[PDB]
């Protein structure tokens, strides 16, 4: 439906241990295909998906020099932020940055973004129009005044509506078998008695992709409360898992129904616990 | 005996106004046989470099290549000399030399009041305008250098500008203008268009 490419970056300063640690990663709709580690032996953009390994050395050499310069940009940037917020050198700090492109079935850009965060709090973000910024505090408007003064958003927009969507379709075709495929979930309910007068039903969902899924329990018509919704877990093979449990008394074990929604499960599903 | 050796000299070749990605050479010379030269930059990215001293024409110099100019290389540099190395018996510091980086931000507007062609004796004030909210402006006449620094203000039409009163118009000259921000006084914008000020006689 609405596919996307996303590059994530994390720069953490290490005072007593020299240069900052830089981890960056690339995603095409919940699947990772590239990584770069500052603390690697030969730090370079290495493949993390089988369909990207076919790219010539031009892709790797050019994109390795990219995050190489990005790690230096963050080292300079993390250091500057310490003065912006009146902080000393003895503390460790984080600088997260994330850009990418959302593409819809119209075959072109839908949403572009470039967000930044310092120490887990928002800093500055590219607006929806791809020409303005939004600062989170008075210390972030400074860089906004600099980035507007450098026409930074113009270089952003050229990449977002351009190379980002172009290298998105190129990825979605060369890895179509593993990227444009939806795995429906395997679903079943389990029964766990917690007392002589109480028991728990747990709705399961296994081996589904992508991770977007809805899972709620209903009693004769929609209890979102008293439902133990667990976070979508990665299985490890590129699929995901999720479950929600609800506590019921002894008897009335039925009339409690669980509902699942997904993109591989085409018509919506309804199921209950069968002994 | 020798105590602290006197200061060495420090120059920037071709100059202290280094464009982004360019490389400048920071020479450090003196008539004292300094077998070792230490270049130091103060501020947020403090660093020290060590180059050996080459001796020719009884002068000792060292050519510190600064490398592709980035913002983390801007700042004031000082230089030290040493004859021994077991420990460095460092000399007095050289005069500070502020190395700035240019071309990072949009160029500003350099206007002349009462105009570009002024008559002798009249007062002349140059104005450094820009829609970018620069906190301060740097103005220099061709060659005369001595960059003047004034602060700005958010005008009505959305511009931020500074006025540089120059006094009685004598011979004129060509002037350049740069913009920068408070927290980064060594990170300048693209240079403004060179403004030529011409002087003519008072009518009689």
């Amino acid at each position: 439906g609405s596919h996307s490419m996303r590059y994530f970056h994390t720069s953490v300063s290490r005072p007593g241990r020299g240069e900052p640690r830089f981890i960056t990663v690339g995603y095409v709709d919940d699947t990772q295909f590239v990584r770069f580690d500052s603390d690697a032996a030969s730090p370079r953009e290495e493949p993390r998906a089988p369909w990207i390994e076919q790219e010539g050395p031009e892709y790797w050499d050019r994109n390795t020099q990219i995050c190489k310069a990005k790690a230096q940009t963050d080292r300079v940037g993390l250091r500057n932020l310490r003065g912006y917020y009146n902080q000393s050198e003895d503390g460790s700090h984080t600088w997260q940055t994330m850009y990418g492109c959302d593409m819809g079935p119209d075959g072109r850009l839908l949403r572009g973004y470039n967000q930044f965060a310092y120490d887990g709090k928002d800093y500055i973000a590219l607006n929806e129009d791809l020409r303005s910024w939004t600062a989170a505090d008075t210390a972030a408007q400074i860089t906004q005044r600099k980035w507007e003064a450098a026409r930074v958003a113009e270089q952003l927009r050229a990449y977002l509506e351009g190379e980002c969507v172009e290298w998105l379709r190129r990825h979605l075709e060369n890895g179509k078998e593993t990227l444009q495929r939806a795995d429906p979930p395997k679903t079943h309910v389990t029964h766990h008695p917690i007392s002589d007068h109480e028991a728990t039903l747990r709705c399961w969902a296994l081996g589904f992709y992508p991770a977007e899924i809805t899972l709620t329990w209903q009693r004769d018509g929609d209890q979102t409360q008293d439902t133990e919704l667990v976070e979508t877990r990665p299985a490890g093979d590129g699929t995901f898992q999720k479950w929600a449990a609800v506590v019921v008394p002894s008897g009335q074990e039925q009339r409690y129904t669980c509902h699942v929604q997904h993109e591989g499960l085409q018509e919506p599903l309804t199921l209950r616990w069968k002994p | 005996h020798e105590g602290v050796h006197r200061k060495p000299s420090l120059l920037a070749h071709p100059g202290r106004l280094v464009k982004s990605e360019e490389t400048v050479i920071l020479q450090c010379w003196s008539d004292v046989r300094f077998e070792h030269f230490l270049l130091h930059r103060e501020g947020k990215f403090k660093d020290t470099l060590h180059l050996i001293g080459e001796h020719h024409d009884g002068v000792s110099k060292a050519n510190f290549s600064i490398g592709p100019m980035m913002q983390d290389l801007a700042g004031t540099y000082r230089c030290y000399g040493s004859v021994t190395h077991s420990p460095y018996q460092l000399s007095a510091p050289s005069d500070p030399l502020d190395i700035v980086i240019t071309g990072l931000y949009e160029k500003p507007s350099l206007s002349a009041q009462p105009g570009p062609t002024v008559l002798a004796g009249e007062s002349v004030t140059l104005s450094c305008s820009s829609r970018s909210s620069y906190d301060m402006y740097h103005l220099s006449r061709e060659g005369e250098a001595h960059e003047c620094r004034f602060s700005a203000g958010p005008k009505v039409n959305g511009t931020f500008q500074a006025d540089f009163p120059l006094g009685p118009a004598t011979h004129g000259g060509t002037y350049r203008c740069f913009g920068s921000f408070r927290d980064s006084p060594y990170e300048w914008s693209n240079s403004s268009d060179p403004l030529l000020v011409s002087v003519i006689g008072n009518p009689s």
């Binding site: 994109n63 990219i66 940009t73 952003l156 980002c164 | 990072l104």
Partner: peptide, 10 residues
């Protein structure tokens, strides 16, 4: 391809 990135810092 990744973004070339703006050489300017914050």
């Amino acid at each position: 391809n990744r973004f070339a990135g703006f050489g300017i810092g914050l």
